Design a protein around this ligand. Structure first.
Ligand SMILES: Cc1ccc(OC[C@H](O)CN)c(C)c1
Lengths: 237, 300
């Protein structure tokens, strides 16, 4: 069924699974026409496909050329996402194919189900959780590679960096979702927190700074404070 | 004008014949229905007074045999049987009419309701959906499940309707995923009409038969099947123009005939609101849309 708080540890068991987020597939800049109407111009997007156990990220970059001459782009975006996910599964060796795919928005269920008819033993699941994956484009290196792309392109990342050398997947996912929830609620401040100390750097082969265990505690605390605050500033509490 | 005689009526029962019903008392002197119109299939059906559980009945065509009803006190139901001896049958029927022990099929002149509900229903096709080849008539009841149902348990007592599944490979061409899911014309016109049913009349006949089994027996799998076949047409952008106009007529009479007090269970809100207000064919069902609004504006 649906993934929720009750069955949250299934994510870190040994059955391969992927989250699919489509929030950033179709992106625009609504603007004004010389005639005073409004027109959109698309920019490059991405599918966020993530193995929550291993941190492997399959970042499919959606180039603006995909949309040319197409109608009803918000609906196409969902079928284009489902086509790309099924192509990814097909490209993987059988022993690497997921046993479940969890979509972060329920409107992806039918598109993905239809594109995956050839894989009847892969379960397509919604979730009740409000995961903050839309904020993946606030990670500078991911945003950079999407915006520089001149053609369709798949880029592979580990979104946990080397954290799994020291912490479990469960803890790694919790750090990721906290970091992403903070960037989604107040990107400016979240980035100020992560980069304030010029002595903490991001390795060329990583996405996040090189924090000690103690420094990660301090960072996580600061991210929590920001999320509650903005919850205050947003709700006046 | 043909006749279905009854040996007797030992238990109290509501008897139905097409869209009509009447009550017979326990051991009332009752020996059948005469003046049944030739040229149509018919259905004669039963609901016991003592146990409204199980509506059941028999589809038949009087041109294919002499049929009569006889209660079975072992199996506990009114059974249809064929009489092979022609002069035995005429003589039995003739005696029962002389004694005026038979009720008359009240075919009011002006009325074409039955014709319009069974226009495309053939006995030959009924008997492929309901497999029991030693008989010329077909038994159906409330509880019989469909082939598609048994996939999701006795195959002999099943309803072999054509399986329709909008999220299946039969329905969805590789590389046309989105196209074929949002516009089902491929599945309707190529897979089903050209491939399986061969023509629209056979398609309409199964649609009509599914609805009648849903209405008369409360057969849930038949209602599923009726709705599926409507949705496949309403969700195809390309349908032959003659099929669209006929469909409006077909549905109109089904909605007209439905008991008002049964609409809560026999009509699927989603299918009808999609067909009437959102689908490709939302503008091609004027008569059906009019009667659904005068009569069931609540569901909508
Ligand atoms: C063959 C047949 C059809 C209808 C009949 O009367 C229906 C009447 O309204 C009582 N409900 C009878 C008695 C026979």
């Amino acid at each position: 069924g649906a993934m929720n708080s009750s069955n949250y540890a299934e994510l870190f068991n040994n059955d391969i699974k992927l989250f699919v987020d489509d929030t950033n597939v179709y992106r625009v800049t609504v603007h004004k026409t010389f005639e005073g109407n409004v027109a959109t111009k698309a920019i490059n997007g991405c599918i966020f496909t993530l193995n929550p156990k291993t941190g492997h990220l399959f970042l499919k970059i959606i180039h603006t050329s995909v949309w040319a001459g197409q109608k009803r782009l918000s609906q196409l975006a969902k079928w284009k996402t489902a086509e790309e996910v099924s192509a990814l599964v097909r490209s993987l060796p059988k022993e690497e194919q997921p046993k479940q795919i969890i979509v972060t928005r329920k409107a992806m269920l039918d598109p993905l189900e239809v594109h995956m008819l050839d894989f009847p033993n892969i379960a397509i699941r919604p979730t009740e959780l409000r995961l903050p994956f839309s904020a993946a484009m606030s990670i500078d290196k991911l945003s950079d590679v999407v915006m520089k792309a001149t053609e369709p392109q798949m880029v592979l990342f580990n979104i946990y960096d080397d954290w799994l050398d020291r912490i479990s997947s469960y803890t790694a996912f919790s750090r990721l979702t906290l970091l992403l929830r903070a960037l989604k609620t107040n990107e400016e401040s979240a980035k100020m927190i992560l980069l304030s100390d010029p002595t903490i750097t991001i390795k060329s082969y990583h996405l996040w700074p090189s924090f000690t265990d103690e420094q990660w505690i301090t960072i996580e605390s600061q991210m929590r404070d920001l999320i509650l605050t903005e919850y205050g500033r947003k709700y006046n509490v | 004008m043909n006749t279905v005689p009854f040996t007797s009526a030992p238990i109290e029962v509501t008897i139905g014949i097409d869209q009509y019903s009447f009550n017979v008392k326990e051991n009332q002197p009752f020996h059948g229905i005469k003046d049944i119109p030739i040229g149509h299939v018919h259905v004669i059906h039963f609901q016991h007074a003592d146990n409204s559980s199980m509506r059941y009945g028999y589809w038949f065509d009087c041109r294919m045999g002499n049929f009569y009803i006889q209660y079975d006190p072992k199996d506990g139901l009114y059974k249809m049987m064929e009489e092979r001896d022609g002069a035995k049958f005429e003589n039995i029927v003739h005696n029962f009419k002389e004694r005026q022990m038979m009720v008359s099929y009240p075919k009011i002149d002006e009325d074409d309701t039955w014709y319009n509900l069974t226009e495309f229903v053939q006995m030959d096709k009924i008997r492929k959906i309901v497999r029991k080849d030693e008989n010329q008539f077909s038994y159906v009841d409330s509880s019989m499940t469909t082939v598609q149902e048994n996939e999701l348990s006795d195959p002999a007592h099943s309803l072999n309707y054509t399986v329709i599944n909008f999220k299946s490979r039969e329905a969805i061409r590789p590389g046309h995923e989105m196209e074929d899911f949002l516009d089902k014309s491929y599945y309707l016109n190529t897979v089903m009409l050209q491939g399986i049913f061969k023509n629209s009349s056979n398609y309409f006949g199964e649609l009509q038969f599914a609805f009648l089994n849903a209405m008369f027996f409360g057969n849930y799998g038949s209602s599923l099947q009726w709705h599926a076949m409507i949705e496949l047409i309403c969700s195809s952008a390309t349908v032959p123009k003659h099929m669209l106009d006929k469909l409006d007529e077909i549905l109109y009479y089904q909605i007209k005939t439905l008991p008002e007090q049964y609409s809560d269970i026999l009509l699927n809100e989603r299918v009808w609101n999609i067909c009437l207000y959102s689908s490709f064919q939302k503008n091609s069902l004027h008569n059906t849309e009019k009667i659904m609004e005068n009569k069931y504006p609540e569901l909508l």
